[PDB]
Write a protein that binds this ligand. Structure first.
Ligand code: NA
Length: 207
C-alpha cells in the first residue's frame, strides 16, 4: 500500500513510520512545510503507526533528539515515539479489510487528517487546537498535550486491569476531537476500508 505523508504545517516536522519492532519504509524523514513523502507499506502489516516529531536535531549519522515523538534518538524510527504524539494507526489486509483510526491515547502534538486516496471509506481528522486548550497538568514543556496515563501512571488512566471509564482528562480530548480515540476503552472510531486501499496523512490539514 502507498501512503503519501504531507506536511501542511508552517513549521518543519520529522515524520515517522513504524510497526513497533521495525521501521516502515525508511522509518522517518524531514518534511519542510509543503513537502510530501511517499512510502510503501507491505500488505498485511498489523499495528502500523505514523506520527510527526517536532523540534528535532540530527547529526550526519541520523542520531539526535526531538522534543515530541522521539524514537530512541534516531531519524529513521524502528520503534514507537515518546508521547505526546497524535497517532495515525492502521492494520492492513486483515481478513479482506483495512482498519484505520486516529488516536489521542498517547497525547497530541500536531493536528492530523488520515484519509483514503482510493474509494470505499471515509477519512478521520483531529484538527482542533488541543495544545492551546490543554489542561495545565497535561501540558508538556517541550510542546504538546500529554495523555493522563503518561502523566499520572494510574491503573484508571492506563486501563491496566482492562476495566476503566472515561475521565475528566479523556473527555477533554474527546470534546475537541470526537473522531479520535481518547482512552483505551473508548467506543471505537475505527474506519473499515477495502483491503489494499491507499492513504494520505496530512499534518496541519486546516493550515
Ligand atoms: Na496518541
Amino acid at each position: 500500500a502507498t501512503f503519501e505523508i504531507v506536511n501542511r504545517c508552517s513549521y518543519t516536522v520529522w515524520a515517522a513510520a513504524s510497526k513497533g519492532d521495525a521501521a516502515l519504509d525508511a522509518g522517518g524523514r524531514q518534511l519542510n512545510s509543503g513537502e510530501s513523502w511517499t512510502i510503501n507499506v507491505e500488505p498485511g502489516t498489523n499495528g502500523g503507526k505514523i506520527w510527526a516529531r517536532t523540534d528535532c536535531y540530527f547529526d550526519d549519522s541520523g542520531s539526535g533528539i526531538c522534543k515530541t515523538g522521539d524514537c530512541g534518538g534516531l531519524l529513521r524510527c524502528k520503534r514507537f515515539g515518546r508521547p505526546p504524539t497524535t497517532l495515525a494507526e492502521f492494520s492492513l489486509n486483515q481478513y479482506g479489510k483495512d482498519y484505520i483510526d486516529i488516536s489521542n491515547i498517547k497525547g497530541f502534538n500536531v493536528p492530523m487528517n488520515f484519509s483514503p486516496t482510493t474509494r470505499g471509506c471515509r477519512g478521520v481528522r483531529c484538527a482542533a487546537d488541543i495544545v492551546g486548550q490543554c489542561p495545565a497538568k497535561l501540558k508538556a514543556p517541550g510542546g504538546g498535550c500529554n495523555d493522563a496515563c503518561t502523566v499520572f501512571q494510574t491503573s484508571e488512566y492506563c486501563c491496566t486491569t482492562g476495566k476503566c471509564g472515561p475521565t475528566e482528562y479523556s473527555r477533554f480530548f474527546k470534546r475537541l476531537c470526537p473522531d479520535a480515540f481518547s482512552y483505551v476503552l473508548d467506543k471505537p472510531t475505527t474506519v473499515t476500508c477495502p483491503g489494499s486501499s491507499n492513504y494520505r496523512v496530512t499534518f496541519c490539514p486546516t493550515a
